[PDB]
Design a protein around this nucleic acid. Structure first.
Ligand code: 2TM
Ligand code: MG
Ligand code: ZN
Ligand code: ZN
Lengths: 49, 1344, 69, 99
DNA sequence: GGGCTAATGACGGCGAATACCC
RNA sequence: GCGGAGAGGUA
DNA sequence: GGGTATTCGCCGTGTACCTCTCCTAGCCC
């Protein structure tokens, strides 16, 4: 997604390649992804039953 | 746990194997796969190895703990704890005695040479193709004769009796049992006493050493052949049941099953008395199975079922990276550890780190439980667990309280040097990322672009003290490699500080006078003055001139507002001048440096934090950005490019006509393009650099611009001039795959757009760089691993050995100027003896004193040129080094402390740069004196001719430069035949051309004049006269020894120098008949009939980095070594043209018989009738350190290595202190070889330490008698590590099989004495905090 | 938090047995056989022992005399 | 990811490697060298035995920490014993001597 | 589903094992 | 469900 | 036979971490 960036050092919170982000980005819920895990329970046939 | 020491290794006897074993494993089955109970007598057997489940028999008759020694009557399984199933070993009784592959296939085949029979024969026997006649009675056959099938047949038919022969490993065992060790040893010694020939003497000495090892160690040779084979405890080779009725098994289970199968089938065949052929086949098969068990891979590589990968044998488990010592015994996987992504966290103090709440809770769980139980918040431990798993407010309060002073260790994946692990005090934060203090990133090489870090928790009280005292971030500000600071501000801080301190011609609040920095900030923050504007401010600086007292001087300085604002932070002791300048990267770094040297640690820490905060703040206030217009295309670029294109077009057209070759055109084009690139670069830098033409009150003026990209470049925050060029200029020339440079460069830049071709080319460049970094990284990691390995055991053990020895340290003046000054080269080394002022009896430095900054500056005030300093290599201490011989340099400032492991610090400091630099990468015609000085010639003997030249007749001639006050500024090496201008004494003006020479041509210089007379240069045999007319042109070719034709091989053409009358003019003072052997490629242009001038041209003659460092440290003969002289005296020639010309050095005093062969191609630099010194150069080329050590001695080779390595390292601009290279060199030459006799075996390679204690023992004895006299040896770090005393150290990283086999046969005993072994055994290292412990143990032995 | 131990290492210049004496003292302090000679400011016992060392009250010899007493 | 204590491996009694199973970080040989470069003997010692490989040491240390004491005994790492047993499994007798 | 039996695409370095030249 | 192969990725 | 080249074969080739599939084999009743 395309967001409004400004190139400047902002009290060393973007010191190294790190990135500063505005709470508005989380408010608009625009970098929230859905992930999906699969889990499996297997019931086999043992000789005890 | 017992308190032990001395790990002993030896051959296992069959009785010992029976001793370890609790039962025989007869059948290969393991488990019933139906009922998971194990086998009755199988790889997994309860009656042999132990009960599967704690304290309960298989059949279930006995289950109570009450029974502890009973063995159930139904199942013969004893009732004990299942843990024993991890230690109980089994055994297999082999029907046919089998050979142990390790003792056979190991490069020196010990079965082979022990029997003095080549390996080929052993192979013939083992694969059952041929026999060997063991004691074949009264016939015509010896005792180790290999016999083929039908030779055995005809022998047997002829000789029915007195013929005992057998086959296979059992035959070999028969040979081994019947051998008389001591008798053969004495016979062998007698043979050596009668035999004098090189190769046989070496093989013979090898055999006697093997025999001595057997008779001393107590191993009997027959034990190399296995009869009983032990089987590993089951839990060490598990057969785990995968979920789903399937099983997962180690490959050892497969190999053991195969061995048992072949053994049982061979047993059955023997019980059936099957024909010989089948039992022989079965014995062969059993051999393969067993040797696959022992070491799979020295045969047909028995692959596994349906997987094509070769399965892993026991030897594979030990040897190799993935297997063992490296993997599980030096590389464990700790508890109380975590990992996460690192983040900035600017607000942190230098000594702290942001740690996520949830990670902190998880790590410190048991601490939490303890504190919870102490306060009574939880009745029992399970309630504490439940309370932690709910995570109630009380839990977070307890976490805050326990975390308070508890420090954690932060580590970043490539722990290159010791600053890759540092301790911090954690501060609980939200989030899942670890927050890392910015200043320490440089130490970690950490970047916030997805780098992760691991966090360990020191548990014990001792660990806490070690982390907080020795390892904490604030205690490590100086790099252990060189003395310079590690925590220097990196990019935003330095950019902000630069912006703040730079001044501008005219701004708001120009030229107003301020009473102090405080109102400067009042003015700036209120917007009544620019952050940079020239102003007069009153400031009170403090200076500690007295004995630690601070004196305030308060005056008016002319500065900027910003510089005052910055001055607010600066601690008391520092002069104002420090901040008054532009304050870029270098300036800030040296600021921190001075703050450390003057004030000390704590003020430096606090000042660094302040620097970070102010830099970040004012960088943010600056608003520095990067727009497309911020990078200014030079206005005159297009003109420069069009001009260069016109020039290339003109040169190409003038080529197509054919007056210049292709190579000449190539060179010209490349040079003109390089010139155009430099021109455009300089124009762009002029445009961009000082472009702010802003106006003062009236007229205009010009100043260093405020272009954001320019400030980032100039400040040293990011980018160099080169990258600026690549942005705004033309991006220079490129290299094609093979290294050749494309004729047309890439004229476009990233501000503009490249096109497909230019992009593609730069793509090649980038790809090549990335591949290089990856390959280099692997090579460097190997090199540093070898380094840390070789030097691990070296520790500073003694305070002062008290030796007078030392190395003569000079400033390295390579050619043009002083690449490295004295002060850093000598800083922190103790002196070997007092150095005197330029006037005798004026001692400037007492006997050994540590040379700290003040002494070094004092030496700068005087004009001392060379200082003898104690070096680690010459240190006298036994089993380690002494503090004084080492010096001070550390992360702290003081003399080295007793106990410190200098080996590992040296190895790490020498290896980190090599890996780091690869990531970072991602003619000599005339001499030109640089500074006004006197010329001085060293090691020369000239004879002035009529033309007035100081003719150089010595190959080792040097031309140094003495300055006004007696100092050698410049130094050059002048070869034979170099035209000279000024002789000795003359004062040379600044930058005047004193010499001249042909770039691609070394002339041979005649000393006298007259006619050239041809002697033994007969026409047709070795030379072909093709001569031109009167003007004296010819093509007479005097070829060298190698290139001489087949007929003119022995006929040596010569040139006698005669005068106009005919008589050969003789060299002044000497009677020698001048017989000039024309050297290689002697083009005799000036034919007979032209009076030779002094200087006629006789013959025209037209690696670095990581591999070079690795080669120097491995001491690799560079395949074309230069040659040196052994003794002095008249050299002479000898028996001519055998295929390698003989040179016999004849000493005037010593014995003559030293002959050295020389290949034909070699040219000699010395005359026959010359006075050579020991170790002078005879041939040109790289010299192998071995020769330098042997002839010149220790200090010469160590100086050579140190300088040659330091050259490579400084070429890349990485500064390393010489002490580390010195420590490595000292570790290299740990060994000597004895030349005299008296207590040793007269030739054994033995470490110099034992030899020195042997000499001390002879001195202690009332009669010294023979003593021990020895010769030093220099070994490359791999071999040097291979010849270590401890066998665990050597097995830890090299071929495990070889060293293990050597130690097993030798019966070697390891007292551990070192670091890596002590690590492996899991006890305290003898270095640092644990040194005392080991010292205590030293007192514990041989005491009451 | 005690950010620098520079004065404690200036007391004993080896910088290694400093750790040993401080560990012995802090171990006598944690398992409550002894009492701190300095008013604690909610520090844990490690930093307490370092704070005591830097003030000159405790070293190895004081430990030996007090233990035999 | 973080762990205090959890499941350990079968043959060499070191804690599992990984994230799926709790798993500890690998204090590799380079990290060992880093600790050796300091005079950090006790940290390396605990890291080598009590933190990963020594069974009795790890359980005694858990109990000791819970009890609020931080002392510890080091003992011999189990992986070394596995090494001894494996080398002894060859025809090589390697014994831990005593005097 | 269950039971039983038994090939080719690295490279360097180094040191030992023949090939051969007297 | 400890392990080991193969594949991919991170720094 | 003894020294010198030349082939030959073994040993090594950076760390830390994170995902996925697949694991003794084959044939007949
Ligand atoms: N295959 C790899 C790739 C990287 N690394 C390591 O990860 C870091 C990346 O450096 P880097 O070059 O990516 C950034 P930096 O070094 O700080 O320079 P720059 O910011 O001016 O661009 C380095 O410490 C490497 O040692 C590794 O161990 N194996
Ligand atoms: Mg990074
Ligand atoms: Zn039973
Ligand atoms: Zn010394």
């Amino acid at each position: 997604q395309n967001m409004r960036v400004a190139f400047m050092p902002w009290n060393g919170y973007n010191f190294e390649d790190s990135i500063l982000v505005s709470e508005r980005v989380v408010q608009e819920d625009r970098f929230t992804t859905i992930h999906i895990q699969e889990l499996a329970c297997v019931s086999r046939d043992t000789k005890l039953g | 746990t017992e308190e032990f020491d001395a790990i002993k290794i030896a051959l296992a006897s069959p009785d010992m194997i029976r001793s370890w074993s609790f039962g025989e494993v007869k059948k290969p089955e393991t488990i019933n796969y139906r009922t998971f109970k194990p086998e009755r007598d199988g790889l997994f057997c309860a009656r042999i190895f132990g009960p599967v489940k704690d304290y309960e028999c298989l059949c279930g008759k006995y289950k109570r703990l009450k029974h502890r020694g009973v063995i159930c009557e139904k199942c013969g399984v004893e009732v004990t704890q299942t843990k024993v199933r991890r230690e109980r070993m089994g055994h297999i009784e082999l029907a046919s005695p089998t050979a142990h592959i390790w003792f056979l296939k190991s490069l020196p085949s010990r079965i082979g040479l022990l029997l003095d029979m080549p390996l080929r024969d052993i192979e013939r026997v083992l694969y059952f193709e041929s026999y060997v006649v063991i004691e074949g009675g009264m016939t015509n056959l010896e005792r180790q004769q290999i016999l083929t099938e039908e030779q055995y047949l005809d022998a047997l038919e002829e000789f029915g009796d007195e013929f005992d022969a057998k086959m296979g490993a059992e035959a070999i065992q028969a040979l081994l049992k019947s051998m008389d060790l001591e008798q053969e040893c004495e016979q062998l010694r007698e043979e050596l006493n009668e035999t004098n020939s090189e190769t046989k003497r070496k093989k013979l000495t090898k055999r006697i050493k093997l025999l001595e090892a057997f008779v001393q160690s107590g191993n009997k040779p027959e034990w190399m052949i296995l009869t009983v084979l032990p089987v590993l405890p089951p839990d060490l080779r598990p057969l785990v049941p995968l979920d789903g009725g399937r099983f997962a098994t180690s490959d050892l289970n497969d190999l053991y099953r195969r061995v048992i199968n072949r053994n049982n089938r061979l047993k059955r065949l023997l019980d059936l008395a099957a024909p010989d052929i089948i039992v022989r086949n079965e014995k062969r098969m059993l051999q393969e199975a067993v040797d696959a068990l022992l070491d799979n891979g020295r045969r047909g590589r028995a692959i596994t079922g349906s997987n094509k990968r070769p399965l892993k044998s026991l030897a594979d488990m030990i040897k190799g990276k993935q297997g063992r010592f490296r993997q599980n015994l030096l590389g464990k996987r700790v508890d109380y550890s975590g990992r996460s992504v690192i983040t900035v966290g600017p607000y942190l103090r230098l000594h702290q780190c942001g740690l996520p709440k949830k990670m902190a809770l998880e790590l410190f769980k048991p601490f939490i439980y303890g504190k919870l139980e102490l306060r009574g918040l939880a009745t029992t431990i399970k309630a504490a667990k439940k309370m932690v798993e709910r995570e109630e407010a009380v839990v977070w309060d307890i976490l805050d309280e326990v975390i308070r002073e508890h420090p954690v260790l932060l580590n970043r994946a490539p722990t290159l040097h010791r600053l890759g692990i540092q301790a911090f005090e954690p501060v609980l934060i939200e989030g899942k990322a670890i927050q890392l203090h910015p200043l320490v990133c440089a130490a970690y090489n950490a970047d916030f672009d997805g780098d992760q870090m691991a966090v360990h928790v020191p548990l014990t009280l001792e660990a806490q003290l070690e982390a907080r005292a020795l390892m904490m971030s604030t205690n490590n500000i100086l790099s252990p490699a060189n003395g310079e600071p590690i925590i220097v501000p990196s990019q935003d801080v330095v950019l902000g500080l630069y912006y703040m301190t730079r001044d501008c011609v005219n701004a708001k609040g120009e030229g107003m006078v301020l009473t102090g920095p405080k109102e400067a900030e009042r003015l700036y923050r209120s917007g009544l003055a620019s952050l940079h504007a020239r102003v007069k401010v009153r400031i009170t600086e403090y200076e500690k001139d007295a004995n630690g007292e601070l004196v305030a001087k308060t005056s008016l300085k002319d500065t900027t507002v910003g510089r005052a604002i910055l001055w607010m932070i600066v601690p008391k002791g520092l002069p104002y001048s420090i901040v008054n300048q532009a304050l870029g990267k270098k300036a800030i770094s040296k600021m921190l440096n001075t703050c450390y040297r003057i004030l000390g640690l704590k003020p430096t820490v606090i000042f660094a934090d302040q620097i970070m905060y102010t830099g970040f703040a004012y960088a943010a206030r600056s608003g520095a950005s990067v727009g497309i217009d911020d990078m200014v295309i030079p206005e005159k670029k297009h003109e420069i490019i069009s001009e260069a294109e016109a020039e290339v077009a003109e040169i190409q057209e003038q080529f197509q006509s054919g007056l210049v070759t292709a190579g000449e055109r190539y060179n010209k084009v490349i040079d003109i393009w390089a010139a155009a690139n430099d021109r455009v670069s300089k124009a762009m830098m002029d445009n961009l650099q000082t472009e702010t033409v802003i106006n003062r009150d009236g007229q205009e003026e010009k100043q260093v611009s405020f272009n954001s990209i320019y400030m980032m470049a100039d400040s040293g925050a990011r980018g160099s001039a080169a990258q600026i060029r690549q942005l705004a200029g033309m991006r220079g020339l490129m290299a094609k795959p093979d290294g050749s440079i494309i004729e047309t460069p890439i004229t476009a830049n990233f501000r503009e757009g490249l096109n497909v071709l230019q992009y593609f080319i730069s793509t090649h460049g980038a790809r090549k760089g990335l591949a290089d970094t990856a390959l280099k990284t692997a090579n460097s990691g190997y090199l540093t691993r070898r380094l840390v390995d070789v030097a691990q055991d070296l520790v500073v053990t003694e305070d002062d050995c008290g030796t007078h020895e030392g190395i003569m340290m000079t400033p390295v003046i390579e050619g043009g100027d002083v690449k490295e000054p004295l002060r850093d080269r000598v800083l922190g080394r103790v002196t070997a003896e007092d150095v005197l002022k330029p006037g005798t009896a004026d001692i400037l430095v007492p006997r050994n004193t540590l040379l700290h900054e003040q002494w070094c500056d004092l030496l700068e005030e005087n004009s001392v040129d060379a200082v003898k300093v104690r070096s680690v290599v010459s240190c006298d201490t036994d089993f380690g080094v002494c503090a004084h011989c080492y010096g001070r340099d550390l992360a702290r400032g003081h003399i080295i402390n007793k106990g410190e492991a200098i080996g590992v610090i040296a190895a790490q400091s020498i290896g980190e740069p090599g890996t780091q630099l690869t990531m970072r990468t991602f003619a000599e015609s005339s001499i030109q004196v640089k500074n006004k000085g006197s010329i001085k010639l060293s090691n020369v003997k000239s004879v002035v001719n009529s033309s007035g030249k100081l003719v150089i007749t010595s190959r080792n001639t040097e031309l140094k430069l003495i300055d006004e006050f007696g100092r050698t500024k410049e130094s050059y090496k002048v070869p034979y035949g170099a035209v000279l201008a000024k002789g000795d004494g003359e004062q040379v003006a600044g930058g005047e051309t004193v010499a001249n020479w042909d770039p691609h041509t070394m002339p041979v210089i005649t000393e006298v004049s007259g006619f050239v007379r041809f002697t033994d240069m007969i026409d047709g045999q070795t030379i072909t006269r093709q001569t031109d007319e009167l003007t004296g042109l010819s093509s007479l070719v005097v070829l060298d020894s190698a290139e001489r034709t087949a007929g003119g091989k022995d006929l040596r053409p010569a040139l006698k120098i005669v005068d106009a009358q005919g008589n050969d003019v003789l060299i002044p003072g000497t009677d020698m008949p001048a017989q000039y052997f024309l050297p290689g490629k002697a083009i005799v242009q000036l034919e007979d009939g032209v009076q030779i001038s002094s200087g006629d041209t006789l013959a025209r003659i037209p690696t670095g980095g990581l591999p070079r460092v690795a080669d120097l440290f491995e001491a690799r003969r560079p395949k074309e070594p230069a040659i040196l002289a052994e003794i002095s005296g008249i050299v002479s020639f000898g028996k001519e043209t055998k295929g390698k010309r003989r040179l016999v050095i004849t000493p005037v005093d010593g014995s003559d018989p030293y002959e050295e062969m020389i290949p034909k191609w070699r040219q000699l630099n010395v005359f026959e009738g010359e006075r050579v010194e020991r170790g002078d150069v005879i041939s040109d080329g790289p010299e192998a350190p071995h020769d330098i050590l042997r002839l010149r001695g220790v200090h010469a080779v160590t100086r050579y290595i140190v300088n040659e390595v330091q050259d490579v390292y400084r070429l890349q601009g990485v500064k390393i202190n010489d002490k580390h290279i010195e420590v490595i060199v000292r570790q290299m030459l740990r060994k000597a070889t004895i030349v005299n006799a008296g207590s040793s075996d007269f030739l054994e390679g033995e470490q110099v330490e034992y030899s020195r204690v042997k000499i001390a023992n002879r001195e202690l004895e009332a009669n010294g008698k023979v003593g021990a006299t020895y010769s030093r040896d220099l070994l490359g770090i791999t071999k040097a590590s291979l010849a270590t005393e401890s066998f665990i150290s050597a097995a830890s990283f090299q071929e495990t099989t070889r060293v293990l086999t050597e130690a097993a046969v030798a019966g070697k005993r390891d007292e551990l004495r070192g670091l890596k072994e002590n690590v492996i055994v899991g006890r305290l290292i003898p270095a640092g905090t644990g040194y005392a412990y080991h010292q205590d143990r030293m007192r514990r032995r041989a005491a009451g | 938090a005690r950010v620098t131990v520079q004065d404690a290492v200036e007391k004993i210049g080896n910088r290694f047995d400093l750790v040993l004496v401080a560990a012995r003292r802090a171990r006598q302090m944690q398992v409550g056989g002894k009492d701190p000679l300095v008013p604690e400011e909610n520090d844990k016992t490690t930093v307490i022992a370092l704070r005591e060392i830097e003030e000159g009250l405790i070293n190895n010899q004081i430990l030996d005399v007090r233990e035999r007493q | 990811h973080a762990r205090s204590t959890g499941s350990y491996s079968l043959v060499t009694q070191q804690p599992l490697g990984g994230k799926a199973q709790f798993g500890g970080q690998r204090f590799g040989e380079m990290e060992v060298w880093a600790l050796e470069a300091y005079g950090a003997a006790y940290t390396l010692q605990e890291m080598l035995t009590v933190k990963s490989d020594d069974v009795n040491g790890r359980t005694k240390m858990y109990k000791n920490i819970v009890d609020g004491n931080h002392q510890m005994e080091p003992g011999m790492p189990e992986s070394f014993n596995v090494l001894l047993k494996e080398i002894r499994s060859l025809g090589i007798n390697i014994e831990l001597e005593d005097e």
